[PDB]
């Protein structure tokens, strides 16, 4: 039987990768500073002082944001995440210490954290700039409010909202989605930007891009923090904003699967072409693989998961061309810079998709109309 | 019943080989230097110093790359791999030692590893050349960056990417795919080649070809390392590149199975010929055997697995000729130097495959079009 | 094993990894022992256990 000449390559590769009986485990490099629940308020305070500082130095904002995420996860969950990702980690306990020094010829007391990544002088400088900005703002408006202060319990999660946007755009492979991050951070979080003068989306976003490029285990820690944060029973409005922006990253790097489902839904005719029909068996294999993976597959491209390549549809040039053409005709492809490699199928699918919007007829069979007196109403 | 005159030779041979109750186990030769997680940073450092050295001596790059792979696997997993492959191994512990010698009439301290395969003088020379190149580059551009240094944590995995390309081309039986390796290593890893002056794809590829030819157990260790590396939850971009290039080796040496599936998919008419139909029973037996093997069968030809011959379709000259002709007509066979041994079936299949691309009609039955007003739109 | 060039010759030395006793010290001990051994061998012909 010719119908039995089949190779389930996608499923076979998944079975090969998921039944490995040997494991590697990597070295993160320097010791990882793992804060616990104890210093969560101090890290949030540090984030607030970074936010209330106009022209803030956001060189360490990504590092502090990851510290905040790790303190909300806790030491035990963070360490377990790092083992499960397959990393050798030398965990550093983070505790609060007091430092007295003479700036402006005066003895003043400073409360800092013992971090190998973030030096004490840097934390002192952050606090000093925050104090200068705070007193300037107090002079220029008289009295401060809970809105304008480092004590707000959402100061860390605003920074983590910027981080969530950067995560949504990480699948592009570089800092190319920075403009989209800045735009969406102006639309979302506009009241916050009016609130905090040091909330500079570009600087914070560049800091998070940099920290994710340096430490690829921070991407893992942040994704699992965002899954744990979105697994709560509730929260504040800023935490809801973060959860909404973090689910915006689901399926990032896999737009062609969604656009193929859309091309099927609008019943594009070019899906019936002979070459597309030749590829349908394997494209269906890919879709069954994706829906077998389930929810974990939505962050494969963010995380640089090795099995991300198994979700690709570009190995089906005709189907991919029809899908891209349907997206182009429906006016959703935008500035997507993936290119069709079958120009004729792309053009035909685009033409039909454009024809779809102009036309359109009601299908009365999908309802339960027993008696159709609608003909007389015409 | 004439339909009961059948021999399931492929399944019977597989059952014979998989139910063996006696096992051989071989001798690897010299002692195998098995590094553990401890010296992973040192091996990665050695790889980085090899990469930053223009006109580098890549005679030992394959050996060092295998050392890096074995250190990411660890001593226990590497030793277990070597037992499971059926080898007597005398494992050598690898540890770091300090060596002081007088070069340029100065006492300087050198940090090396105790390897029976790689002598101390060789490691010292690698470090000395790296230092010369580093100072020359520093002079010619002023200040170095994390991009240009041995401390980058991906220096070993770039070398292992070259190794992955060599693995993809190992099924050709010799160093014939070296040009393809060099081309794909220029396309992929182009930013890295701009980054590292000692990244010479030809030299590294020849080193890995040589190490795989000398030690066939390194092929086993590397394949299982690449399966364990692709079984992680995530990583950096270079690790993702490695995983993508290592899945490029899946099915290597078995192109005719994939091309037969493709010939079935495009509905080549010559599959209905009388002789092809005579062979269909056994070719279907082969396909069921492949899909019963599953994912493990994708590396049978790389590994020189004995059961690789059971996946061959060349014992079916007419089916193979139709498959090769379909590939030739579709313009994918390229410079494949397997030859059809039924010229007429090859020519007929090629002619029909060429006819396929020019023609092509939409099959509206595969959609769910309840009402087809498309006839009026023509 | 440590190889170094004394007297312009490559010779192999077998030492122990001790933090208390450096490698150069062990090499020097062996070198002085070799000098004394050859001097004694010259002055009496053949050594004994």
* SS3 letters across chain B: CHHHCCCCHHHHHHHHHHCCCCCCCEECCCCEEECCHHHHHHHHHHHHHHHCCCCCCCCCHHHHHHHHHHHHHCHHHHHHHHHHCCEECCEEECCEEEEEEEECCEEEEEEEECCCCCCHHHHHHHHHHHHHHHHHHHHHHCCCCCCCCCCCCCHHHHHHHHHHHHHHCHHHCCCCCHHHHHHHHHHCCHHHHHHCCCCCHHHHHHHHHHHHHHCHHHHHHHHHHHHHHCCCCCCCHHHHHHHHHHHHHCCCCCHHHHHHHHHHHCCCHHHHCHHHHHHHHHHHHHHHHHHHHHHHHHHCCCCCCHHHHHHCCCCCHHHHHHHHHHHHHCCCCCCCCCCCCCHHHHHHHHHHHHHHHHCCCCCHHHCCCCCCCHHHHC
Contact A175, A181 (CB under 8 A): no
Q: Which of B97, B101, B121 sits opposite C17 (nearest CB)?
A: B97
Q: Which of residues 108-147 of B touch A (CB under 8 A)?
A: 146
Asked if B120's CB is within 8 angstroms of C4's CB, the reply is no
Alpha carbon distances (Å) from A268 to A18, A340, A341, B142, B363: 36, 16, 18, 58, 12
Rounded to whole angstroms, the Cα distance separating B360 from B266 reads 11
Among B366, B245, B325, CA closest to A279:
B366
* Partners of residue C23 in chain B, C-beta under 8 Å: 100
Q: With H, G, I as helix, E, B as strand and everything else as coil, classify residue A116.
A: coil
Q: Which of B280, B362, B377 sits opposite A2 (nearest CB)?
A: B280
* Partners of residue B291 in chain A, C-beta under 8 Å: 6-8, 12
Asked if B332 has any chain A CB less than 8 Å from its own CB, the reply is: no
Asked if B271's CB is within 8 angstroms of A2's CB, the reply is yes
Rounded to whole angstroms, the Cα distance separating A163 from A170 reads 10
Asked if C7 has any chain B CB less than 8 Å from its own CB, the reply is: no
* Partners of residue B288 in chain A, C-beta under 8 Å: 4
* Residue B222 Cα, gap to closest chain A Cα (Å): 12
Q: Which of A1, A14, A304 sits opposite B284 (nearest CB)?
A: A1
* Partners of residue B99 in chain C, C-beta under 8 Å: 2
Structure resolution, Å = 2.9
Alpha carbon distances (Å) from A52 to A144, A329, A363, B80: 12, 46, 58, 57
Asked if B100's CB is within 8 angstroms of C3's CB, the reply is no
* Residue B64 Cα, gap to closest chain C Cα (Å): 21
**Chains C and B contact (Cβ–Cβ under 8 Å for 3 or more pairs):** yes
**Chains B and A contact (Cβ–Cβ under 8 Å for 3 or more pairs):** yes
Asked if A304's CB is within 8 angstroms of B239's CB, the reply is yes
Rounded to whole angstroms, the Cα distance separating B222 from B137 reads 33
* Partners of residue C17 in chain B, C-beta under 8 Å: 97
Rounded to whole angstroms, the Cα distance separating C41 from C48 reads 10
Q: How many CA atoms lie within 13 A of A217 on its CB side?
A: 25
Asked if A343 has any chain B CB less than 8 Å from its own CB, the reply is: no
Local structure of residue A87 (DSSP, 8 states): E
Asked if B74's CB is within 8 angstroms of A12's CB, the reply is no
Count of CB atoms situated within 10 Å of the CB of B341: 13
Which positions ≥6 away from B78 have C-beta within 8 Å? B34, B70, B221
CA angle A273, A275, A278 (to 5 degrees): 110
β-pairing, A96-103 vs A106-113, is: antiparallel
Contact A255, A319 (CB under 8 A): no
Distance of CA B226 to the CA centre of its chain: 9
Local structure of residue A377 (DSSP, 8 states): H
Asked if C4's CB is within 8 angstroms of B121's CB, the reply is no
Buried-state track A279-300, b at ≥16 Cβ within 10 A, e below 16: bbebbebbbebbeebeeebbbb
The pair phi, psi for residue B10, each rounded to 5°, is: -65, -50
CA dihedral B199, B205, B210, B212 (to 10 degrees): 110
Q: With H, G, I as helix, E, B as strand and everything else as coil, classify residue A63.
A: helix
* Residue B63 Cα, gap to closest chain C Cα (Å): 21
User: Across the A/B interface, how many CB contacts are shorter than 8 Å?
Assistant: 173
Partner chains of B (3+ C-beta pairs under 8 Å): A, C
β-pairing, C9-13 vs A91-93, is: unpaired
Q: State the method.
A: cryo-EM
Alpha carbon distances (Å) from A163 to A157, A231, B285, B352: 9, 18, 54, 55
Local structure of residue C8 (DSSP, 8 states): T
Rounded to whole angstroms, the Cα distance separating C10 from B362 reads 80
The pair phi, psi for residue B113, each rounded to 5°, is: -115, 145
């Amino acid at each position: 039987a010719l119908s039995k000449v089949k190779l389930n390559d996608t499923l076979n590769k998944d079975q090969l990768l998921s039944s490995s009986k040997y494991t590697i485990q990597r070295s993160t490099g320097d010791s990882i500073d793992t804060p616990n629940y104890d210093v969560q308020k101090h890290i949030n305070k540090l984030c607030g002082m970074l936010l209330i500082t106009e022209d803030a130095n956001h060189k360490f904002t990504g590092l502090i944001g990851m510290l905040y995420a790790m303190s909300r996860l806790g030491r035990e969950d963070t360490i377990k995440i790092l083992r499960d990702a397959g990393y050798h980690v030398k965990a550093n306990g983070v505790d609060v210490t007091t430092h007295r020094q003479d700036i402006n010829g005066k003895e003043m007391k400073f409360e800092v954290l013992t971090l190998a990544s973030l030096t004490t002088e840097i934390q002192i400088n952050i606090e000093i700039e925050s104090r200068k900005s705070y007193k300037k703002m107090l002079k220029e408006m008289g009295e401060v409010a809970p809105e304008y202060r480092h004590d707000s319990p959402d100061c860390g999660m605003i920074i983590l909202c910027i981080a969530a946007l950067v995560i949504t755009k990480l699948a592009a492979g570089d800092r190319s989605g920075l403009t989209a991050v800045i735009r969406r951070a102006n639309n979302v979080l506009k009241n916050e930007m009016k609130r905090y003068k040091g909330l500079l989306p570009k600087d914070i976003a560049n800091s998070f891009y940099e920290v994710f490029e340096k430490h690829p285990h921070f991407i893992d820690v942040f994704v699992h923090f965002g899954i744990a944060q979105s697994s709560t029973r509730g929260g504040s409005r800023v935490e809801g904003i973060f959860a909404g922006l973090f689910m915006n990253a689901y399926g990032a790097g896999q737009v062609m699967l969604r656009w193929g489902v859309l091309a099927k839904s609008v019943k594009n005719i070019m899906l019936g072409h002979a070459s597309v029909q030749a590829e349908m068996e394997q494209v269906v294999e890919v879709y069954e693989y994706a829906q077998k993976l389930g929810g974990e597959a939505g962050f494969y491209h963010i995380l640089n998961n090795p099995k991300a390549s198994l979700l690709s549809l570009t190995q089906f040039p005709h189907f991919s061309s029809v899908v891209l053409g349907n997206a182009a005709g429906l006016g959703i492809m935008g500035e997507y810079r993936g290119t069709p490699r079958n120009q004729d199928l792309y053009d035909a699918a685009k033409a039909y998709a454009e024809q779809l919007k102009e036309n359109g007829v009601i299908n009365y069979s999908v309802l339960d109309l027993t008696a159709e007196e609608l003909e007389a109403i015409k």
